[PDB]
Amino acid sequence: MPNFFIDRPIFAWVIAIIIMLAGGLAILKLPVAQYPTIAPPAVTISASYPGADAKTVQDTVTQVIEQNMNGIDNLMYMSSNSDSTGTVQITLTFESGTDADIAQVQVQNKLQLAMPLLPQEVQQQGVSVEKSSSSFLMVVGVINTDGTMTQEDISDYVAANMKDAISRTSGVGDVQLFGSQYAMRIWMNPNELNKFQLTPVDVITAIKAQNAQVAAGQLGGTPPVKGQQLNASIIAQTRLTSTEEFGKILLKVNQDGSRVLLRDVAKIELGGENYDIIAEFNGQPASGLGIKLATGANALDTAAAIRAELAKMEPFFPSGLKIVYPYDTTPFVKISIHEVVKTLVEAIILVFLVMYLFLQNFRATLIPTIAVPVVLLGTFAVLAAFGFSINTLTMFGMVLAIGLLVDDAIVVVENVERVMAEEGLPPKEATRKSMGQIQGALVGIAMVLSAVFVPMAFFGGSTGAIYRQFSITIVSAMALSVLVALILTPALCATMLKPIAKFFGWFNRMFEKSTHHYTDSVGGILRSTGRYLVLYLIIVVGMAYLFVRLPSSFLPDEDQGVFMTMVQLPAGATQERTQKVLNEVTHYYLTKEKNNVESVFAVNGFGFAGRGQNTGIAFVSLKDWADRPGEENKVEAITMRATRAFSQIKDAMVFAFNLPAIVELGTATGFDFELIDQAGLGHEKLTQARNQLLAEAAKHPDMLTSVRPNGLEDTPQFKIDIDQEKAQALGVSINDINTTLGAAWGGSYVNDFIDRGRVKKVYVMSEAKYRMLPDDIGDWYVRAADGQMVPFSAFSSSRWEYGSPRLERYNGLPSMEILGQAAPGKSTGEAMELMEQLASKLPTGVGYDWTGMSYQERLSGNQAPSLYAISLIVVFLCLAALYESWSIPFSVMLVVPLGVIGALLAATFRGLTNDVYFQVGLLTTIGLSAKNAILIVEFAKDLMDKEGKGLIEATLDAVRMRLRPILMTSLAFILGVMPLVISTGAGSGAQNAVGTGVMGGMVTATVLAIFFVPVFFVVVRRRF
């Protein structure tokens, strides 16, 4: 409606002010994260049964819970793990878009009623149902180096003085704790248990009932007697605080009046709760936190508030504690936002420069300077209206749509300057005629492109949330540009531009002689157009040939500033050997990378193959990007050089790796293939079925590579069977045997107590040196029925036998999660098919099931051409609606293979992959080439019937007058991202993925596709 706004410019300014004021009001109110919610919601039931193994947890806690996880809405699958430390880990994955609070409350209420079925120790330890959110925002570690304290003193200073206050700030969530807080530990000693004639059952029974409450009522209790004057509460016996009070419990008094106490048959030593995880920071002990960003707070000021709250606790530290940050991916977010903002601002500066270079007037070269940023502000307002945030995805959505942003001002201002320069009109009537020439064309552009992107918004899975960000950001920005293009720019071309009619004039002469030479060449090649048609056939066949031979992937790997190093020791290695290997790793990183590596935070018993004691992980954080210049100092070189330098450790699997986004790695190659056991076959026969399925995938190297089992193999275990007749003939109860064995050799968790205000736990267990060999079971005596001490091995035996350190279940049936990846060259559509054709010759009862990242590749994983198949005909119908003809859209939509040649050539030459930035850049390049091909033929169509010209004459007349816009807006764009292409700094993985496609594709779509559309239009108007 531009003629309403030519006569009314102030109303155009008013709606420009409300859209620019509603944009800037919504930039102060929307989140700034790094990536949005990208994974389907998944809740996690986690429980522990102390002292058990994988088998005991796997059929007292695991199978008991997952028989009662029924009737939960929108559930896809469920996978569980039970390992030898006692831990059970159940993950329920839900549909995309399922409300996570409702899902967690339904899972936790179905678990609240399956609670009396569980054992007693699991109910005391507690079962935790919590939602599995993203990974760590930041890790706040803390050390002590000026002096010496243990790990537990640091962890208790954190658990009593930081976690209470760090979680009380603007925008935090789950706060973990790498250490372990206090517990009144009791170290039993079996020789004094022998000589005083006691058992650990007597110890646990003696200190159950020492610290407990008394519901004692009150003096003057109600009902009172007539005349009562006094009222006060009885405060009876309470808990026990100090360790001497825990040492002064009477056990047994003898005939001679002897006093047996806990400090005679034990030692107290207040100490730590869990002794499996030992954190480490550069060679001194440490502790840490686990801060998660919650839902809708920006991570920048969140991390600033965390650093501020740690910054006001240094006056309160015990003379030597120091806070240090071994994992921080917050300044990388700040870099990845600042570079995109700088690219937008320098693109506006470059279009100012190009407009003044081609038009030579200061007064009309700033219509894009006013009219382009208001669309970006309106785009931020629409992004906040949908509820989306400042991701990396929306930022790199507005940085490659800036051509579509900036064309809808260049076209208008060039066309009104052309009308003033040729026919010689005042700016008002010239703007009327100019915006009447391109009236319906811009509405046709808004209909014809809105259909190129919006099928990208309707995929499914975890990659239908990556595409939706681009496919609503670019749609909103373009559909607001087309509104502001016929409202704001006509008013600005009617008011600002000068009515005055008419020596650096070399560029003008060069441009006019290039224009005349162009028109002569195009008029030459509109006769005998067969060679250019067969050249177009060679172009489209070359497009298909280079499109097949190009590796597909996801989001590029880049320098987040940190990387991990994983350590695993073979099959039952202790904690000390893993500490020696971790110290070798620390001594490597702090000597051979003096000028690259800043801090290595070494955690023991933590590794990603599962919990345990023969594993370890190491968070290595480097220096700043400005401090390590070069190509040989980025993470991609340090990782392979450390992995090459970690092959000389004789017995340790140690390797370094980077961080992709969170989880959906394998760049488009992995499997997640569950081998399920849908009968009563068991575990050893399922292991034989897996061992048959492996080494049949090794028979096909051309299709399959790196098929690793993802699961721990069988380790020896120490079976001790209680002989029944010897136990009951000698008169020894089996319950006292089992509560001696499973309380001297594991924790027992008697009860709680109160220390310094807080509430801690009390564990009983034997010493560290009476439970370390198979020859230490003979030091444990148990009372019989009469009172005679009976030893172990008087009623038992001892064998070593193979067990299992980890037991996996999938949808309630036993399974083994075989991982793999496809070979180079072949996709994962003909690799998963070979897995399904290869898992069908297994023995009877063993089935297969896909899970994880491949699960939503089975549920309609071939609906990518099925949506552009209905995008293409909507494009065809809009173009047949515009020109009032059929087969004119055939003349305008044969420019789709023109902008693909340059993008595929640049991706092949530079060495890129078919990631999502390449696809979105290809999908904008073809749309912009279609936009140019629409405008040239809209001039040619409304020049040979409104005037009466011929066919060749009107065609070269139309391509004459539509040459000054096209290279003006390519030169302001295949130049507004040149730096992004040559960028090598922090976060140049996404920047090069954006830059290389939209450089080569744009150059090819403007060099070639100004010579084919006269040929296409003439060939169409010959053969209808």
- 416: amino acid identity, one letter: V
| Burial of 708 per CB tally in 10 Å (0-12, 13-18, 19+) | exposed
Longest dimension (CA), the chain: 130
Region binding ligand CCCCCCCCCCCC by CB under 6 A among candidate stretches 498-506, 511-519, 802-810, 996-1004: 511-519
Residues numbered 370-389 forming contacts with ligand CCCCCCCCCCCC, rule: CB under 6 A? 370, 373, 376
Question: Which phi and psi (to 5°) does residue 39 adopt?
Answer: -115, 150
| Partner whose binding site includes residue 495, from ligand PTY, ligand CCCCCCCCCCCC, a copy of itself, none (CB under 5 to 8 Å by kind) | ligand CCCCCCCCCCCC
Q: Name the amino acid, one letter, at 281.
A: F
Stretch of 15-23, 102-110, 209-217, 420-428 contacting ligand CCCCCCCCCCCC, by CB under 6 A: 15-23
Q: How far, in Å, CA of 24 to CA of 378, rounded?
A: 8
If the CB atoms of residues 30 and 100 are measured against ligand CCCCCCCCCCCC, the closer one turns out to be 30
Give the residue from 385, 488, 404 showing the smallest Cα distance to 448. 404
Of 346 and 776, nearer to a copy of itself (C-beta) is: 776
Strand order from edge to edge, sheet including 813-818: 128-131, 42-48, 87-94, 75-83, 806-810, 813-818, 673-677, 846-850
Q: Give which of ligand PTY, ligand CCCCCCCCCCCC, a copy of itself, none residue 774 binds (C-beta under 5 to 8 Å, depending on kind).
A: a copy of itself
Nearer to a copy of itself, 53 or 417 (CB): 53
How near is the Cβ of 539 to ligand PTY at its closest, in Å?
29
Q: How far is the CB of 9 from ligand PTY (least distance, A)?
A: 12
Q: Are 758 and 164 in contact (CB under 8 A)?
A: no
Q: Are 879 and 893 in contact (CB under 8 A)?
A: yes
The letter for the amino acid at 687 is: T
For 318, other C-beta atoms within 10 Å of its C-beta total 12
In degrees and rounded to multiples of 5, residue 591 shows phi and psi of: -125, -40
CB of 932 to ligand CCCCCCCCCCCC, least distance (A): 14
The listed partner (ligand CCCCCCCCCCCC, a copy of itself, ligand PTY, none) that binds 847, CB under 5 to 8 Å by sort, is a copy of itself
* List of residues contacting ligand PTY (CB under 6 A): 1, 3-4, 11, 14-15, 18-19, 22, 25-26, 29, 334, 337-338, 341-342, 345-346, 378, 381-382, 384-386, 436, 439-440, 443-444, 446-447, 450, 454, 457, 468, 472, 475-476, 479-480, 482-483, 486, 864-865, 868-869, 872-873, 876-878, 881-882, 893-894, 896-897, 900
Alpha-carbon 36 to chain mean position: 8
Q: Around Cβ 238, how many Cβ atoms within 10 Å?
A: 11
Min CB(980)–ligand PTY separation in Å: 12
Contact 117, 130 (CB under 8 A): no
- Report the site for ligand CCCCCCCCCCCC in 30-49 (rule: CB under 6 A): 32
Beta strands at 182-188 and 271-272: parallel, antiparallel or unpaired: antiparallel
Chosen from ligand CCCCCCCCCCCC, ligand PTY, a copy of itself, none, partner binding at 313 (C-beta under 5 to 8 Å by type):
a copy of itself
| Binding partner at 344 among ligand PTY, a copy of itself, ligand CCCCCCCCCCCC, none, C-beta below 5 to 8 Å by kind | ligand CCCCCCCCCCCC
**Which of the choices ligand PTY, a copy of itself, ligand CCCCCCCCCCCC, none does residue 517 contact, using the CB cut-off of 5 to 8 A by kind?**
ligand CCCCCCCCCCCC
Should residue 344 be labelled a site residue for ligand CCCCCCCCCCCC when binding is judged by CB under 6 A? yes
Report the alpha-carbon distance of residue 895 to residue 422 in Å, rounded.
Answer: 30
- Is residue 799 a contact residue for ligand CCCCCCCCCCCC (CB under 6 A)? no
Q: What separation, in Å, do the N-terminal and C-terminal C-alpha atoms of the chain show? A: 34
Q: Which stretch binds ligand CCCCCCCCCCCC (CB under 6 A): 186-194, 445-453, 512-520, 788-796?
A: 512-520
Q: Tell me if the bond preceding 9 is cis, omega within 30° of 0.
A: no
User: Is 428 exposed, middle or buried (CB count within 10 Å of its CB: 0-12, 13-18, 19+)?
Assistant: middle
Residue matched to tokens 């920005």: 477
Please give the structure tokens belonging to residue 788: 């005679």
**Contact letters for ligand CCCCCCCCCCCC, residues 703-732 (x by CB under 6 A):** ------------------------------
Distance of CA 292 to the CA centre of its chain: 13
- Burial group, residue 311, by CB count within 10 angstroms (0-12, 13-18, 19+): exposed
Stretch that binds ligand CCCCCCCCCCCC, among 24-32, 181-189, 279-287, 836-844 (CB under 6 A): 24-32
Q: What is the DSSP string of 311-352?
A: HT-GGGS-SSEEEEEEEE-HHHHHHHHHHHHHHHHHHHHHHH
Amino acid at 798: S
Return the residues of window 953-992 that contact ligand CCCCCCCCCCCC according to CB under 6 A.
Answer: 967
DSSP per-residue string spanning 864-902: SHHHHHHHHHHHHHHHHHHTTSSSHHHHHSTTTTHHHHH
Is residue 565 within 8 A of residue 573, CB to CB? The reply is no
Neighbours of 724 (CB within 10 A): 10
Pick the stretch among 340-348, 553-561, 595-603, 626-634 that binds ligand CCCCCCCCCCCC (CB under 6 A).
340-348
Does the footprint of ligand CCCCCCCCCCCC cover residue 438 (CB under 6 A)? no
Residue 899 tokens read as 């902008």
* Minimum distance, C-beta of residue 403 to ligand CCCCCCCCCCCC, in the bound complex (Å): 15
Q: Which of 177, 496, 550, 874 binds ligand CCCCCCCCCCCC (CB under 6 A)?
A: 496
- The answer to whether 714 and 767 are in contact (CB under 8 A) is no
Question: Which of a copy of itself, ligand CCCCCCCCCCCC, ligand PTY, none has residue 376 at its interface (CB below 5 to 8 Å by kind)?
Answer: ligand CCCCCCCCCCCC
User: Would you say 217 or 524 has its CB closer to a copy of itself?
Assistant: 217
- State in angstroms the smallest separation of the CB of 734 from a copy of itself: 5
Among residues 222 and 528, whose Cβ is nearest to ligand CCCCCCCCCCCC?
A: 528
Q: Rule CB under 6 A: which of 925-954 touch ligand CCCCCCCCCCCC?
A: none
**Which position has the token pair 């031979």?**
549
Cα(714)–Cα(625) distance, rounded to whole angstroms?
45
Contact 160, 77 (CB under 8 A): no
Please report where in the chains the tokens 């090649």 appear, as a residue.
525
The smaller minimum CB distance to ligand CCCCCCCCCCCC, of residues 219 and 349, is found at 349
Among a copy of itself, ligand CCCCCCCCCCCC, ligand PTY, none, the one that 112 touches (CB under a kind-dependent 5 to 8 A) is a copy of itself
Partner interacting with residue 157 (select from ligand PTY, ligand CCCCCCCCCCCC, a copy of itself, none; CB below 5-8 Å by kind): a copy of itself
Tokens of 92: 């329920």
From candidates 4, 7, 11, 17, binder to ligand CCCCCCCCCCCC by CB under 6 A: 17
Quick check: 13 binds ligand CCCCCCCCCCCC (CB under 6 A)?
yes
Amino acid at 564: M
Question: Is 498 a residue that touches ligand CCCCCCCCCCCC (CB under 6 A)?
Answer: no
Task: State which amino acid sits at residue 307.
Answer: R
Residue 572 binding target from a copy of itself, ligand PTY, ligand CCCCCCCCCCCC, none, CB below 5 to 8 Å by type: a copy of itself
Does position 514 interact with ligand CCCCCCCCCCCC (CB under 6 A)? The reply is: yes
Q: What is the spatial distance between Cα 346 and Cα 139, in angstroms, rounded to a whole number? A: 35
Amino acid at 413: V
Bridge-based pairing state of the strands 653-657 and 806-810? unpaired
Q: How many helices (H) and strands (E) does the chain have?
A: 40, 31
Q: Which residue is nearest to ligand PTY (CB)?
A: 440
- Binding region for ligand CCCCCCCCCCCC (CB under 6 A): 9-10, 13, 17, 20-21, 24, 27, 32, 337, 341, 344-345, 348, 370, 373, 376, 390, 495-496, 514, 517-518, 521, 873, 876, 886-887, 967, 1024
